[PDB]
Design a protein around this nucleic acid. Structure first.
Lengths: 94, 90
DNA sequence: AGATCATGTGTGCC
DNA sequence: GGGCACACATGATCT
């Protein structure tokens, strides 16, 4: 556990910490609600903190999960409406 | 710089660290690709998910979902136009 | 070795 | 006479 060796942890662990920061920033940058903002932290006029990015990430996913429910509902409504038109048209002469 | 206010600074930092871990765990819990796994870290609540894994997956899963909406949009357009084209018959 | 996560610190902004 | 985020540098553990 010499002087060479503690410099080798503080190389490894610094990387762990900017590795986390960059993943947090990448996540911020695909969320259109917060993508443009500057950050409280070193990635490598309001500053976004790690908590807020992580909170918004969860909300932004609920939003996309919601939208998928709405899309699978929209689809069913439209397929349903196509069905009723095809029936009405098939059975009018009858 | 003193025993009682040392003590307090840590009390604080522990809470900050558990807030970040709980937020990461929530982000995990909403991503069905990873939601039911174990965690490498303490939440304030056989191999364990790590922080960066949850972060990478959250980005993977948001791209997936954004990409699917484009497919959903197309499915909707194809249907709306199939309706257009039945109704112009009357 | 190398990654990871937990613990104390010191710093700087509100 | 305060809390906060964040960075840093260690210690402990696991592959």
């Amino acid at each position: 556990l010499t002087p060479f060796q503690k410099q080798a942890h503080n190389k490894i662990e610094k990387r762990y910490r900017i590795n986390i920061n960059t993943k947090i920033a990448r996540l911020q940058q695909i969320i259109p609600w917060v993508a443009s903002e500057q950050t409280a932290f070193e990635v490598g006029s309001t500053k976004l903190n790690k908590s807020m990015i992580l909170e918004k990430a969860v909300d932004y996913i609920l939003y996309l999960q919601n939208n998928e429910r709405l899309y699978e509902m929209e689809v069913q409504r439209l397929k349903s409406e196509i069905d009723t038109l095809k029936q009405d048209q098939k059975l009018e002469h009858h």
